[PDB]
Amino acid sequence: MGRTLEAISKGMSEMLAKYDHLVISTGRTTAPAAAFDAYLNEHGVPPPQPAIFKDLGVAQQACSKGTMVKNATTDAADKMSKVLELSEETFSKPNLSAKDLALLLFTHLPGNNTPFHILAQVLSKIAYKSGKSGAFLDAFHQILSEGENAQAALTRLSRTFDAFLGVVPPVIRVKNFQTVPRPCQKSLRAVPPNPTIDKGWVCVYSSEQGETRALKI
Amino acid sequence: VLKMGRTLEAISKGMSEMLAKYDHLVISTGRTTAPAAAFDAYLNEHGVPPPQPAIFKDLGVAQ
Amino acid sequence: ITPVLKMGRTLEAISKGMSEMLAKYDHLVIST
Amino acid sequence: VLKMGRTLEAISKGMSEMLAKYDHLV
Amino acid sequence: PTQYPDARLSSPIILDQCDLLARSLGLYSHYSHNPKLRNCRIPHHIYRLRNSTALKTFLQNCSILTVPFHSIWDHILTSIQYDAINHVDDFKYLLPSELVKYANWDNEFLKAYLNKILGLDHVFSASARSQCEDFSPKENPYYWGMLLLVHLSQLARRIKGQRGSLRSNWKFIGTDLELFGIADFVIFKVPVKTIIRNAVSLQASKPGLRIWYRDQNLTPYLCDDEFIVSVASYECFIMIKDVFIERYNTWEICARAWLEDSDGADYPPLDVLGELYNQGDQIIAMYLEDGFKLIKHLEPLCVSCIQTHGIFTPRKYWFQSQMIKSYYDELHDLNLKLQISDNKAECAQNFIKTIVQAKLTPQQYCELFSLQKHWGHPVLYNDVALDKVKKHAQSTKILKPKVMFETFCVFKFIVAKNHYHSQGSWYKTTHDLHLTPYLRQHIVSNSFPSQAEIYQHLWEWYFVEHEPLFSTKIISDLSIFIKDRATAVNQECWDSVFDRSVLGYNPPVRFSKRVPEQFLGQADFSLNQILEFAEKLEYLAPSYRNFSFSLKEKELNIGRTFGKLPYRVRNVQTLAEALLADGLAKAFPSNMMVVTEREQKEALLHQASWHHENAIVRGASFVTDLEKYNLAFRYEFTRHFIDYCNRCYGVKNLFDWMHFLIPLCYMHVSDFYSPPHCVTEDNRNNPPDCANAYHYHLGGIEGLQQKLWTCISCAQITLVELKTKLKLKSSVMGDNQCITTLSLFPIDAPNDYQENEAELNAARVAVELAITTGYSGIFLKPEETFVHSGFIYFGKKQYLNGVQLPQSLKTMARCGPLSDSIFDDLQGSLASIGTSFERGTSETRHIFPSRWIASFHSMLAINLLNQNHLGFPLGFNIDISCFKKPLTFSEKLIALITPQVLGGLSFLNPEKLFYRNISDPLTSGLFQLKNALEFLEKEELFYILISKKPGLADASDFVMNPLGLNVPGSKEIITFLRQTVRENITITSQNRIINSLFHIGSDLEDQRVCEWLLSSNPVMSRFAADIFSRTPSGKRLQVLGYLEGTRTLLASGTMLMKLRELTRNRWKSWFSYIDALDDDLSESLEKFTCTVDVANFLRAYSWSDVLKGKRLIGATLPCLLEQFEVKWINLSEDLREQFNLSSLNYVSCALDRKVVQKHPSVNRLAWTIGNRAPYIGSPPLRVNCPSAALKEAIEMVSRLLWVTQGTADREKLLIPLLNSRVNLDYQTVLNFLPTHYSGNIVHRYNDQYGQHSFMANRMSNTSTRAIISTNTLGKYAGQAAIDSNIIFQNTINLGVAVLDIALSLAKLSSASNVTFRLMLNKCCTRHVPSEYLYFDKPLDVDLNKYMDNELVYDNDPLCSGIK
């Protein structure tokens, strides 16, 4: 029985090392399972002593039996699970909401309250709704790296990016045509038959009295 | 020999079970670890509890 | 030579240690 | 076969000590 | 007298005590969050200030309300900037037009010098716009404000220095913004109308004021009064002065650079500066202290813009995206905390947009990164500061035993592997072999397992035990205890650090605190007694359970703390860190990195191969922060590392001190005016938790166990490397840690494919490291981490794809007229300016813009100290008291031209643009002086200025200053105070080590040893200095140097008179040259023409009394710029037009045409790199652990053997010197000497034991394209080469520096090439015959007196392994 004995010798030595390290690391004050459960149920928070759990998921679920309330121990486990969710294709990848994406585009544009600011709001909302915000941001950045400015990048993205083909411009409710921003007044036009974004129509301003003006860029 | 075959078949099952469980364990820290170590080191060195030991009673260590 | 006899005796002690540790693991580790 | 016996005795020695340490906790 | 208030800002800005001044004047203020200050009784030294009549008239017609300091900050800066020109009569001295005149003259001089050296006329031309006198006054917006604040800051330093007289004050009255300075405070006074500015109410105009006055009708308090007041401290005023000086220097350097180049200059343009400066000021005014949260983002934003420059990959824009998102989040919080409308906060959006939308080059972003501190610093609150620390150090962590287990085993493996590769064998194991099978048959066969198979059998390292290593009773330095440190008080008297009136009771026990004053007070100080103190756990006594924090000086966060321990616990910490740094921290390479684009291909292939050429290597790096590690360490994790260290040193309980002691203390900040919120008289012994203070700290603190934590970090990186099977190289700066992953590709791979795959591999590693540290309780935050293929921090510098980027402004913007010296010394100030200038040139490619600033501030120091010295009465005029008439422009100029070695005040040597270490300062100084006098047209003054009357100096002065002259004016001021410091040491000292080192007859020993070292038949001063540094006299001088920077030791009326008389004498010697003359010496010198002959004659004449007719050797070496001349062989056609030119032994230099990397283009030489590396071209026994004493004894034996002759009686000269350091006999020592018996004593001493420069003082990009060849200089390439003046390591530095300086502004192309040669001249080369020193008498003095000092003596020199 040499093989069936040598395998047992090596496995036993390894098991011995690992469990000896564990007991020395948390020793002499660690709370056993019964005492831990009693303290938690009776006080509502876990004891100030070290404890040993079977899995990370068991630690995420350690709460008082009577009511479910988060405790310092639970928070520690949730932080660690969020770390475990990391993947190496999306390490430090920016996650941006529609409002958040718009703020970035504004940082790259010159002036204030120009037609390109309205175009940026509209495009960011449409792209985020269809779940293509990361691809949209990467395409914008690529055009910037080629050597162009943000305005040419936005016009080219409106023409070619897939999420905007055959999309009707949104409608904005205003009191009158004095409410539209001053730099955008000169670009207002009459509503075309079938407006669409990939042809250069940003949005539709509808006044309080049914008068509609189309913004052209 | 047969008692040995049965004891080995029990030992291998127990050892594989312990190693599989060890792969998934997790522990949480507490505030009684370092003070308990200090208290034990002082008794081992001198044979009596450290002076002004009231703080160790507050932490639940002096025993 | 004493070693073979000793090995025969020890496996029983090792089995006892393993049973005791399987016992202690059930009290130390929280699994609710 | 002598090496096996010696190894087993060494393993048994360590088991006894590491069991004492666990006896302190519970 | 010795100490004065600090010239520059170095302390945190705390405004607690201001609340106490306002309550005593009847005003309202709410700076502090501490409720003790609302109702305590005012301290008497503050309450008495309300009685001054000057302060009561200054506060007439003011409101009861005050405003915080920053809400005014904006208006203060603007008002001083625009109003300072109407107050020129206040600083009519300082002669502004003369400052500009001197600086212009100095640039013209340096241009002439460099045109002559480089051999090309007209390399440097005239932009007549920078050269007119009216350029800086008319076009720099900070000129007049900077001069006014230089004057006012000197007044403020004088008033604060006086201990409080109630009549000592200063004031300044302007169109707006009146100022008033009293003991510790400065009061700013502004009209109300300029703050309301046509708004509904005061809070409507400045919303940040809602914190003090929530919503109250304030108009009843503001109608009848025309002014409003802000109370602040002296540090706020000094910080304003610092901001003006920094902004002035920065604007001037940028403006001049853009006139010099005008196409691409490596400095941000002036549009960007004007915009950023104004918008940051507005952000600060509006958001107060918080604004710093937004302004703190300037540095990461600059880095993120640099990173977007290589070959496009989407990941290259991720860091920038993360930073932008982070910036607006902060804004969204601030706008809800102050209820700010979107239209009000336009300044914050303009700040971020100005940075991003400016499309600068990587060089300009790297320089703009340096403007981080140009807006001032925030106010700190100790409760806000300690909330963050408390939360992080008491939190609970979730740890995984498997990860901790594996990183511990890797720790033990690293130690074992380093031992084996050092001593060729396994250490002596004492553990049972049966437990670890894989390691047993490597131990029995004495072989070490390979890197590949280590992971499979990793567990077996848990059982390995062995014999102790690294004996404890010896540490190398033993002078770390003497050094200055800050300590806390003992726990019986822990209240004594607070004010009695703020506390509310008188503490029962009152306490000294400084380390230099407490090391001298300790009567015994053994080193074994500290060990015993730690081993017996003596500290756990109730007396040593106090710990206190203190805040850091110049940062932009809410407050970072460094900790302070009692005196004896500080000794325990110091001993543990020293033991670790010598013995075991050596097994962990924490700086193994070098920049991979600059490394040879063979080395990369060998290093990046997992096991052991047709392969391509591409690297990618990421950066992590080590600052957030300290508070996250828990005992459950570090028990095992600490226990293994204890075993490795044989000691027990030594490395556990921090985790055993820190959780038993009461954590608080020791601010004089902010005690813990809740401490009372009966509550005092066991106080409770409150906002300031708390119990049960569970983590570490910033610097307590730095060595051990860096070692654990290296162990986790090695564990990750075993897990991912990729080669990693890590490096550690002060704060950041950079990790580089090396990946291998086949030869036929597209460049885009390599760029993408390298970043993917670096990301696998970053994810793995994040998990490994998260299961140890330390959380990397992926948002502030970036992964990049080109960007790296390596030294304190930044590289992009191997191209070094400039960082010159960081050091040149802090240039100023005054520095921190003793009694406001003029040489101290000028020397500080000179060193800052030489570092600044090493980090850029523009020379003249920085040189103008350095010269400007030199002349300014002279004028300011002439008429506003702090050590004299208020108006004194040093020059009138000395010479009976004021100084002229020409006299000041001549002092600033004469080199310091000759007794003048010139510290800006042009030769230091080429290399820092100059072989001989006398010959180079003579070369520079001759050139300057030829430019100035006063060529007849040369022999008058260099021939000055020798002073009175002993032999010890000549031994301490080997290469200098005996002139009174070149001597430093500290040499006049040293004698006093030594006297106090023999009065106030009880330390046994110090009393034994400074015994009763030590002065006679120093005198006798110095006289003996200069008694050889040819005298050699370099040898004498080298020997003197290692005898006990050198140790005595080192200890004096450590203890000098103290108080009440250096200080201890008649001291003021001694210092005043010394200062007047020094001014007479610097600024009068007809008074100091030797007509005989000048008559003798006029015959020589070479600078070497002149230096030899001056050294012989100056030290005639010491030399006694013998002749001096080994000191004079030729100046390189006079020995070699530059001759141009071939220049391309596009450079001939730019240099405006129309058409044997030598070193040959050329420019390499092949370019490897470039950013942004190939148009400047400093924007590109190449392949070359010209700097790379240029013991039978050994003890494992040699102490410092043994190293120095070996060096002395080596030097003295090499100097004397073989047929001599060498042993009897060696015994008296060697018996004073170690216990070896003579014969055993020779067994450690390396190979000898080759050299030429005069020549080979300088190169064998001298100190050289390993590189040119330029940016390191040029060296990578230089082809230097020293094979063509004939018979000097060892025939007459070992027997000449030439140093062949310095010609390479000169060749690289000439190539760099000549093409610093030229516009390059793909067709340009350059080749020249450095030609040898005959005047300076000498043939120095081999010569021995003959000692006719052994030393007759008993140097054997220090067998009790372990600081000096090694009782058992070889107790470690013989090896």
Ligand SMILES: [Zn+2]
């Ligand atoms: Zn010469």
